[PDB]
Design a binder for this molecule. Structure first.
Ligand code: DZ4
Ligand code: CL
Ligand code: CL
Ligand code: MG
Ligand code: MG
Ligand code: NA
Length: 327
DNA sequence: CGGCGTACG
DNA sequence: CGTA
DNA sequence: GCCG
């Protein structure tokens, strides 16, 4: 088992679901406390189990696995022995965990805002609604739409949204294309949002595109919320439903075609897969990776890529299709 | 011990 | 600060 | 919390 998640296939469904979910509770709780190092270790240990070919049944099967030391091994041991890990269950029922989870789930609220509200004594969404002077416009929209945004987006919803986006994109710039990214491209059947990447085959023609797209979607009455020159848009869309509609989060990103492979790779995720890939690039290969390119800081040159396959090759990694990037 | 991804709105 |  |  290699030490970086980008060195191994990770399928969406696997053989250690309960164990990985427990470790991910501890990771999440570490994040709520600002302990990014412990969050990473617990996330990485969970991802190792996702990559295994069969269930862990005995503690000895953790020997030699990367990111399993005393703490993660004890969590697994308790689950194998008793079906429950007391530390995990204490986190789950804690007022701190439940409230930080509730607040950070709001669009416009991160850990730092949630923690301040927590320290001020706030505990429920209605506590927040009562004191709207303390809310940004973004947070007001996130709170108004919270119930709909808590409902999974279905793969069956995505095709209708993509057609609507393509219509607006085609008027804004004929020839421009829309690619489905994020978790749906990794094979997820549900999501928290829909992520789309937009480009044009003629380098430079995509400049200034996203404002043109957004004002056309707004004119069609489809935009319940957006922040408005820009290249990323974090929107709330009106999605038709039988006899009604529901609010859905949609992310739009524009990239020039020269950067499209890097943007596709970055926006297809998973989040941990990309952090691990960028960590691998820099620490193992001395190259700096982001959603725009891959930089050699010694030659001061950028690596041209025409495909995701090119990028894996330039990093010395076996290619992984999106379905195997579910770290 | 230092390091832990890297951007844009 | 928020967001991907 | 774990790796190197
Ligand atoms: N902090 C981060 N660092 C690096 N890449 C990140 C990132 N956050 C997101 N990405 C990249 C990788 C992510 O896969 C992609 C989309 O971000 P989401 O839409 O927040 N997450 P997904 O679509 O995977 O699942 P779902 O929406 O169902 O929760 O952007
Ligand atoms: Cl930490
Ligand atoms: Cl980036
Ligand atoms: Mg998504
Ligand atoms: Mg998104
Ligand atoms: Na949030």
């Amino acid at each position: 088992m290699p030490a970086y998640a980008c060195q191994r296939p990770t399928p969406l469904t696997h053989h250690n679901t309960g164990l990985s979910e427990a470790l991910e509770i501890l990771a999440e709780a570490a994040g709520f406390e600002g302990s990014e190092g412990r969050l990473l270790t617990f996330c990485r240990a969970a991802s190792v189990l996702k990559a295994l070919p069969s269930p862990v049944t005995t503690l000895s099967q953790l020997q030699g696995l990367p990111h399993f030391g005393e703490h993660s091994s004890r969590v697994v041991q308790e689950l194998l022995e008793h079906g429950v890990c007391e530390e995990v269950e204490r986190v789950r029922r804690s007022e701190r965990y439940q409230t930080m989870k509730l607040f950070t789930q709001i669009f416009g609220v991160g850990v730092k805002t949630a923690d301040r509200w927590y320290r001020e004594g706030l505990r429920t969404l209605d506590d927040l609604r009562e004191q709207p002077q303390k809310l940004t416009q973004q947070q007001k929209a996130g709170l108004q739409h919270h119930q709909d945004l808590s409902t999974p987006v279905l793969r069956s919803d995505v095709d209708a949204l993509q057609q609507v986006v393509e219509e607006a994109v085609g008027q804004a710039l004929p020839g421009a294309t829309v690619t489905l990214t994020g978790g749906f491209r990794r094979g997820k059947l549900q999501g928290h949002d829909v992520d789309f990447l937009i480009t044009h085959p003629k380098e430079g023609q995509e400049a200034g595109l996203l404002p043109r797209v957004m004002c056309r979607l707004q004119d069609q009455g489809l935009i319940l919320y957006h922040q408005h020159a820009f290249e990323r848009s974090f929107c709330i869309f009106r999605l038709p439903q039988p006899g009604s509609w529901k609010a859905v989060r949609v992310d739009l990103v524009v990239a020039p075609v020269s950067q499209f492979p890097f943007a596709l790779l970055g926006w297809t995720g998973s989040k941990l897969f990309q952090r691990e890939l960028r960590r691998f690039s820099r620490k193992e290969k001395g190259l700096w990776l982001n959603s725009h390119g891959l930089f050699d800081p010694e030659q001061k040159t950028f690596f041209q890529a025409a495909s995701e396959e090119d990028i894996f090759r330039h990093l010395g990694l076996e290619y992984l299709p999106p379905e195997q990037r579910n770290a």
